């Protein structure tokens, strides 16, 4: 195992990660970030 700087939050009774990877990945590239999907109404 290795020590890694990463935030951990508590939701309900479960300890989960909370990652928002937009600077480590998808920064200064030519690809669009997912989770910005569209809807049709």
């Amino acid at each position: 195992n290795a020590r890694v700087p990463a935030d951990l939050v508590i939701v309900g009774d479960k300890l989960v990660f909370l990652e928002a990877l937009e600077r480590r990945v998808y920064q200064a590239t030519r690809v669009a970030y997912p989770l910005i999907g569209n809807i049709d109404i």
Binding site: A28, R30, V31, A32, Y33
Partner: protein, 49 residues
């Protein structure tokens, strides 16, 4: 006369140190785009093209 020289040249030498910050403020104000344009340009546009 020598004392008037000393006082006058004292203020003159202080004037350059006082005006360097003025020139920096002017050249930074001529170089700064507005925030109301720059923030959604760098946020709502991910990469470019």
């Amino acid at each position: 006369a020598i004392q008037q020289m000393a006082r006058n040249l004292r203020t003159v030498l202080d004037s350059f140190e006082r005006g360097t910050a003025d020139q920096l403020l002017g050249v930074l104000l001529e170089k700064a785009p507005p925030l109301s344009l720059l923030s959604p340009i760098n946020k709502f546009q991910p990469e470019g093209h």
